[PDB]
């Protein structure tokens, strides 16, 4: 699969995020317990809640499609469908909203992805969400200054940065410590205080952000200069126009 046209670094990074064969760079270690804390759907050690019985106990009808499509493990167990949501700064966060949704439906099974300008969300079965979330938090999908885990009050993608390079957060879930150079997650994604904060590590430096980003900007790589990517967008516009008029 080729995923996306273009010859910029931005275009290559977009392809890399989409490509399940591309092994995402691990930038930080976050324990399974701290993923569960950040998510805020259940307490550590709490058995998974259930929205319905395990598939073995709710007797699905005979169906070739069901027989051919393997349920994800959380579906087998009847897990709730829960979410994780990120906001990405337009100041060179590595991932960006359509990049995430496109990538999620190439890389992850059983995924409900939604794109908005100031928030991007995935909803899936709870135990699977936990595994996906570990990857979303530990790898270059995430930077703790230019990205934020936010289930509400998402304002910030388009705001100026603060003096530490941190994106705005109305609820200040992620706190930069000048004395350590690290970001601490002090609240879960919905904004409730953690009894024990989670170390998110150091923010990426500015040159590395520019190297890894998937946003086009005049002060980075501009979309208008990635002429092959622009060509394909214009082509799609024209062919959609033609098809709607007369597809013969």
């Amino acid at each position: 699969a080729q995923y996306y046209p273009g010859t910029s670094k931005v275009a290559q990074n977009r392809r890399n995020f989409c490509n399940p064969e591309y092994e995402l760079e691990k930038l930080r270690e976050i324990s399974d317990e701290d993923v569960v804390k950040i998510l805020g759907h259940r307490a550590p050690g709490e058995e998974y809640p259930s929205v319905h019985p395990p598939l073995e106990e709710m007797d699905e009808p005979e169906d070739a499609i069901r027989e051919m499509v393997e349920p994800i493990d959380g579906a087998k167990a009847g897990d709730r469908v829960r979410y994780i949501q990120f906001t990405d700064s337009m100041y060179f966060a590595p991932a960006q909203p359509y990049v995430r949704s496109r990538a999620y439906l190439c890389r992850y099974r059983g995924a409900d992805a939604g794109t908005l300008s100031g928030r991007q969300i995935i909803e899936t079965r709870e135990r699977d969400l936990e595994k996906v979330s570990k990857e979303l938090l530990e790898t270059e999908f995430f930077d703790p200054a230019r990205s934020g885990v936010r289930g509400k009050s998402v304002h910030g993608h388009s705001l100026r940065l603060d003096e530490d390079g941190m994106m705005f957060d109305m609820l200040r879930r992620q706190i930069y410590n000048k004395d350590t150079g690290k970001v601490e997650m002090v609240k879960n994604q919905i904004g409730d205080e953690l009894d024990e904060p989670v170390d998110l590590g150091e923010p990426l430096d500015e040159e590395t952000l520019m190297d890894k980003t998937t946003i086009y900007r005049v002060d980075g790589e501009a979309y208008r200069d990635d002429v092959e990517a622009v060509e394909i967008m214009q082509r799609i516009h024209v062919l959609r126009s033609q098809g709607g008029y007369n597809p013969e």
Binding site: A1, Q2, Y3, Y4, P5, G6, T7, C18, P20, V51, H52, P53, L55, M58, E60, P61, E62, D63, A64, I65, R66, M68, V69, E70, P71, I72, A75, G78, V81, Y98, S101, R102, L105, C106, R107, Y108, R109, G110, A111, D112, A113, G114, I121, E123, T124, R125, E228, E231, I232, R235, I236, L239, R240, Q242, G243, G244, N246, P247, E248
Partner: protein, 442 residues
């Protein structure tokens, strides 16, 4: 034949049934099983005799939370259902042993009614089905118990609700798959105003049958709307065949290859490879490390893409056994496939657009709801001309119980009655056999 295309037809287990069937043998305009299904759905009514009885004995008539104290009537309708049904049938029929049916279900608690076809030959539309059924049952109930003139208006209220003060049959204890003509978003829309949950309930959550029934209703509406006339006809026929009838086993084989470990993206890759193998698309030119694909047959590319879209929904929402992500699949299958190929997505962007709105209106405060309450007449999901809603039906068929407004919640009366009808419940074999029957008339 107007079109030279031929398709191979399969059953819902992926077995070859008929080879090289002319495309037009699947047309709603030609295929006698589609005709039978559509006429059947027009003329079938579910009657809730238990509901009528309970409404009368409590005087709870005329809509939610309504009651008229002092108007209670205690009538043993369910206990006398055989006589009432036979009396109603005598009024509903045109002639003895015509195609009228009145059949009791659930020990007399429900009745399946099929109003005779002859009444619709001389009708403008389809409302004769509920209106003839309603008055026949009102009259039969009055006559069964010698209900007085002074009290009979309560029987009327219990059967048909607040109509005509309300435009709809508000609080009625009869139900149809179709809704009243005034609620159409546009002329020609009536076969689109059928709730996804009704289709899923009727087909007993069999995924391919739900997709087939939904596609039959949607694409048949496209003919009534005039959308499948002239330049657009072949596009709609190929959509019907490849997206809803598993033509060439393409949907089935994509699901087979991607069901164990696959994603929306992996289904896309397989579909593009298949389109290239079959000569539907080819490389038009090369950019830097990027192949630009073209086609001389937009309608066939669209149909292949539509088959992949259905398979992608089955793989993604099937893996979750949760329907909500169908709005996401309908969006990003199409978004991804455009940037993968340089070709337009299904319905030239209209499925992606529908999906954007549908995603919004199934995850926000402003309206909509769960996938099951949508339909082709819904303002959110009317925009694609038949290529989106059948995927929603497939996704809801695959849902293992994540929805509050499930078919069990919204569609129990419809399920009980309409799933009795073989051609409604399992339409694909009937449409395939009918295609075989007329193949030499095309």
């Amino acid at each position: 034949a107007k079109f030279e295309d031929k398709v191979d037809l399969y059953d819902d287990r992926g077995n070859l049934v008929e080879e090289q069937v002319p495309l037009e043998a699947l047309s709603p305009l030609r295929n006698p099983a589609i005709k039978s299904i559509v006429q059947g759905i027009k003329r079938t009514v579910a009657v809730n005799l238990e509901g009528i009885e309970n409404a009368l004995k409590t005087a709870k008539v005329g809509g939610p939370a309504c009651k008229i104290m002092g108007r209670e009537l205690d009538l043993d309708i369910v206990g006398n259902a055989e006589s009432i049904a036979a009396a109603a049938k005598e009024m509903i029929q045109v002639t003895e042993d015509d195609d009228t049916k009145v059949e009791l279900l659930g020990g007399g608690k429900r009745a399946l009614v099929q109003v005779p076809s002859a009444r619709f030959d001389v009708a403008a539309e389809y409302s004769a089905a509920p209106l003839v059924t309603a008055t026949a049952f009102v009259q039969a109930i009055i006559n069964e118990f010698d209900v007085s003139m002074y009290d009979a208006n309560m029987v009327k209220a219990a059967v048909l609700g607040r109509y005509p003060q309300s435009v709809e049959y508000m609080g009625a204890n009869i139900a149809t798959m179709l809704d009243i003509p005034q609620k159409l978003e546009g002329p020609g829309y009536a076969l689109r105003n059928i709730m996804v949950n009704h289709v899923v309930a009727t087909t007993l959550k069999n995924t391919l049958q739900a997709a087939a029934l939904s596609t039959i209703l949607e694409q048949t509406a496209m003919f009534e709307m005039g959308d499948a006339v002239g330049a657009f006809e072949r596009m709609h026929l190929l959509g019907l065949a490849y997206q809803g009838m598993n033509a060439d086993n393409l949907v089935f084989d994509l699901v087979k290859a991607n069901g164990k470990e696959g994603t929306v993206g992996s289904v896309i890759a397989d579909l593009v490879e298949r389109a290239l193998e079959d000569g539907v698309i080819k490389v038009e030119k090369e950019l830097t490390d990027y192949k630009v694909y073209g086609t001389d047959d937009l309608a066939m590319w669209n149909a292949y893409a539509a088959a992949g879209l259905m398979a992608a929904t089955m793989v993604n929402q099937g893996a979750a056994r949760a329907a909500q992500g169908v709005s996401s699949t309908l969006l990003y299958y199409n978004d991804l496939i455009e940037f993968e190929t340089g070709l337009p997505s299904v319905d030239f962007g209209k499925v992606e657009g529908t999906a954007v709105g549908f995603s919004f209106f199934s995850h926000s405060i402003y309206g909509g709801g769960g996938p099951g309450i949508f339909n082709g007449n819904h303002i959110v999901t009317r925009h694609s001309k038949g290529f989106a809603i059948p995927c929603v039906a497939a996704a809801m068929a695959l849902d293992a119980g994540t929805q509050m407004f499930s078919p069990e919640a919204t569609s129990g009366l419809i399920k009980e009655v309409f799933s009795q009808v073989d051609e409604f419940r399992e339409p694909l074999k009937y449409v395939v056999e009918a295609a075989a029957e007329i193949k030499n008339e095309i």
